[PDB]
Design a protein around this ligand. Structure first.
Ligand SMILES: *[C@@H]1O[C@H](CO)[C@@H](O)[C@H](O)[C@H]1NC(C)=O
Lengths: 190, 245, 200, 179, 13
């Protein structure tokens, strides 16, 4: 491909929020070729060198009292501000999930079968998926693909249950998410 | 103590000509600026400059102006073709940090005056007026009055010199000069200044008093076809010795 | 994009407190600058305000900030004549460009202790026939008005500080091309005090 | 209860490529188009509820460009060690015939942030409906990227996602077909 | 309401 050597500079400003704007921590990070050289931590109060390369920068930036006092106040002027700007559409974002229950392969009764519960297009990522046989919860034989971030402010997950279905059985998938007041239920009859 | 310097103090140019405004921003500064203030108008932004590139510019800029960073000292603003409206105080500024969170250090300014024809330019006529004898007896003080008359445009820097050295104590000059013909638009100006000293100081005949007036006019390259003397950038003075009586 | 300051000009007596407003955008605030611009000198930064509600002090000059309402108040406690300058405020957004206000031109009227008003005649250093009239030592309350005639020239009152002997004087100069002009009828156009001394 | 907002920036040489973006818990809030000098909101809804001055980003990129030159010289021209991506192809929702869906290509755990991504319907490159995210940040300072392809599922049609990166000798090709 | 940029500073030379 392109044999030419590359030189990368990455800058990151992390705004860590604990119970809203109650506790805020700013993390100014300088990264050269994937290696973090120097950082500013609001908890520390001044620039500190991570690696040897960042040592002249931590020294110079700590000498500038303006920039230093500017950065200490940034937890309020920048972090706390930007939180309030987004809060209504970012923190308070609620998108209801589309729940669907289907068997992996059409299998006859009394034979081994895997049931799939698909929870898709929801925000935030915090979701509770529970399987029920006939009113009572089935904790054993459950397999989850994990939480998948779609990149378009939506999430998706697939939760499976190992079953040996019988005549009377009516399996149901229970989904708990902040978008809904009462848990979402989609049932599958054997 | 470091300062943003600008040369010259005042400048005269004929309409349509190209003007290069020179500035020496503080050596270690990362951001350089150009601002301008038209008489009875706000100080308006023109251009900001960082790492050999324009950061921010005005809508008016690019069509009418350009900037160059030649040496590691000078920074210049260029006016393509001067308009009558381009007559303003030109400020060169610079800030230390690249984050812009710091103050901007302003230059002294360059008063640019754009005229249709340079034929209206006139140097001042300086005259020193000796203190009154009535003042010497009554107040026990002596006021010397300087007078710079018949000058156009308002490109005058008055200064008082006592015993060959510049003085500031007991010195006051008019902030704005008066028009000699208030009806005319291109009217010549008149400016007055005062210098108050002790009666015994003026009474000492050894003491020398001179009023210096620096005028900013034409240069030797500018074409002059009129009968009268060329109104070039010159120093016109008037002096008076101490009078014992 | 738009910054306003009121008034454009302000006159205040020596020792009296003075305040002036600065109105700037209520959104996208980064910094608010205050500059002291003296005649013939370069505008010098007084304050660079970045935190809302944070008060700053630089001698007798105090500054407050309200980013939410879009206003800033500058206060000069017991104003001195040296404070006579144009005070400009500038709004800085995300960039580095400053959006300036109109600026409040502050003129500090001096306290004239023991005023001795008088009109004196000055002779030119080179000519005897050429002269000048000087209205001086009048208190700050007296104002000097312009001449009615186009041949007579009268300058506005100018404050001179004799730094040495600690003395402040108000003065006005008058001259005319037409010889039918004298000291007694020079400053008659203005409200001259009753104690004004005239020689011979 | 615990949220993180990240202002992630980068500048890369000799490519002369720079990107500025805001990240709320892994999702891009917005980014700045360097060429157009405009703010680009991830979801059009954001532009109705918030604003951003693009100059703040342009000023930061200028500094990043200068800082990169300083660090390049300081490291005695030490180049970046190439880290190859981990490509994964999935769908927006469960696949269902003749029902409009979206194919998602997730390029993850890579550096430098330079990638050539091609969606391939039946071996031929496709451009209709295709959308993409900018280079998203990672805690390990690597990059995340998403490529989208709106489509209608068919048994006849087959999709692929060719991904070129200097970290890998031969381009990663992740296949997708109905079953 | 505007999102704010935490302004980057130049490294030591
Ligand atoms: C992307 O494609 C171009 C053109 O074929 C090539 O020059 C470049 O090296 C490729 N980049 C990567 C990351 O493979």
């Amino acid at each position: 491909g392109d044999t030419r050597p590359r030189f990368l500079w990455q800058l990151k400003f992390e705004c860590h929020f604990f119970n809203g704007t109650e506790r805020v921590r700013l993390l100014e990070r300088c990264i050269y070729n994937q290696e973090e050289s120097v950082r500013f931590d609001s908890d520390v109060g001044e620039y500190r060198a991570v690696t040897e390369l960042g040592r002249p920068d931590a020294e110079y930036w700590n000498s500038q009292k303006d920039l230093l006092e500017q950065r200490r106040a940034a937890v309020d002027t920048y972090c706390r501000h930007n939180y309030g700007v987004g809060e209504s559409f970012t923190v308070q974002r609620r998108v209801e999930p589309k729940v669907t229950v289907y068997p992996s392969k059409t299998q006859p009764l009394q034979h081994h079968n895997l049931l799939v519960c698909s929870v898709s297009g929801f925000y935030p990522g915090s979701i509770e998926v529970r399987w029920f046989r006939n009113g009572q919860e089935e904790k054993a034989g459950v397999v989850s693909t994990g939480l998948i971030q779609n990149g378009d402010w939506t999430f998706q997950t697939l939760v499976m249950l190992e079953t040996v279905p019988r005549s009377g059985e009516v399996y149901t998938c229970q989904v708990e998410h902040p978008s809904v007041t009462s848990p979402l239920t989609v049932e599958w009859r054997a | 103590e470091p300062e943003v310097t600008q040369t010259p103090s005042h400048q005269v140019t004929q309409m349509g000509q190209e003007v290069i405004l020179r500035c020496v921003p503080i050596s270690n500064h990362l951001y350089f600026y150009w601002y301008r203030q038209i008489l009875g108008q706000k100080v308006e932004f023109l251009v900001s400059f960082y790492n050999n590139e324009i950061s921010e510019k005005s809508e008016i800029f690019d069509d009418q102006f350009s900037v160059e960073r030649p040496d590691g000292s000078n920074f210049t603003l260029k006016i393509r073709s001067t308009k009558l409206e381009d007559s303003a105080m030109y400020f060169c500024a610079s800030s230390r940090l690249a984050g812009g969170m710091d103050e901007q250090f302003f230059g002294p300014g360059t008063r640019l005056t754009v005229l249709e024809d340079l034929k209206n330019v006139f140097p001042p006529e300086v005259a020193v007026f000796e203190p009154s004898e009535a003042e010497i007896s009554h107040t026990q003080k002596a006021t010397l009055v300087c007078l710079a008359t018949g000058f156009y445009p308002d490109h005058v820097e008055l200064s008082w010199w006592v015993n060959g050295k510049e003085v500031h104590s007991g010195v006051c000059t008019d902030p704005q000069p008066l028009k000699e013909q208030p009806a005319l638009n291109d009217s010549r100006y008149a400016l007055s200044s005062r210098l108050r000293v002790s009666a015994t100081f003026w009474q000492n005949p050894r003491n020398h008093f001179r009023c210096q007036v620096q005028f900013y006019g034409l240069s030797e390259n500018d074409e002059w076809t009129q009968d009268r003397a060329k109104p070039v950038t010159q120093i016109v003075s008037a002096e008076a010795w101490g009078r014992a009586d | 994009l738009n910054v306003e300051q009121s008034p454009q000009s302000l006159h205040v007596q020596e020792g009296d407190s003075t305040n002036f407003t600065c109105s700037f955008p209520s959104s996208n605030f980064y910094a608010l600058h205050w500059y002291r611009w003296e005649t013939a000198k370069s505008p010098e930064a007084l304050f660079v305000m970045t935190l809302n509600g944070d008060e700053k002090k630089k001698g007798r000059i105090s500054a407050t900030l309200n980013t939410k309402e879009g206003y800033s108040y500058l206060y000069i406690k017991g104003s001195q004549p040296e404070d006579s300058a144009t005070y400009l405020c500038a709004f800085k957004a995300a960039g580095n460009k400053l959006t300036f206000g109109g600026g409040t031109r502050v003129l500090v009227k001096p306290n004239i202790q023991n005023p001795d008003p008088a009109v004196y005649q000055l002779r030119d250093s080179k000519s005897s026939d050429k002269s000048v009239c000087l209205f001086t030592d009048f208190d700050s309350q007296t104002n000097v008005s312009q001449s009615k005639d186009s041949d007579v020239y009268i300058t506005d009152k100018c404050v001179l500080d004799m730094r040495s002997m600690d003395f402040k004087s108000n003065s006005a100069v008058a001259w005319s091309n037409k010889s039918d002009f004298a000291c007694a009828n020079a400053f008659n156009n203005s409200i001259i005090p009753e104690d004004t001394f005239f020689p011979s | 209860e615990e949220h993180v907002i990240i202002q992630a920036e980068f500048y890369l040489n000799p490519d002369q490529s720079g990107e500025f973006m805001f990240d709320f818990d892994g999702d891009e809030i917005f980014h700045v188009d360097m060429a157009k000098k405009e703010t680009v909101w991830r979801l059009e809804e954001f532009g109705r509820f918030a604003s951003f001055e693009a100059q703040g980003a342009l000023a930061n990129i200028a500094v990043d460009k200068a800082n990169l030159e300083i660090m390049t010289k300081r490291s005695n021209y030490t180049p970046i060690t190439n880290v190859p991506p981990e490509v994964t192809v999935l769908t927006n929702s469960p696949v269902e015939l003749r029902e409009p869906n979206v194919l998602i290509c997730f390029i993850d755990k890579f550096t430098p942030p330079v990638v050539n991504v091609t969606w391939l319907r039946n071996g031929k490159p496709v451009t209709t409906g295709v959308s993409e995210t900018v280079f998203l940040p990672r805690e390990d300072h690597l990059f995340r990227k998403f490529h989208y392809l709106p489509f209608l599922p068919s048994t006849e049609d087959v999709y692929d996602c060719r991904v070129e990166h200097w970290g890998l000798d031969e381009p990663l090709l992740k296949h997708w077909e109905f079953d | 309401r505007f999102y704010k940029t935490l302004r980057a500073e130049q490294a030591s030379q």
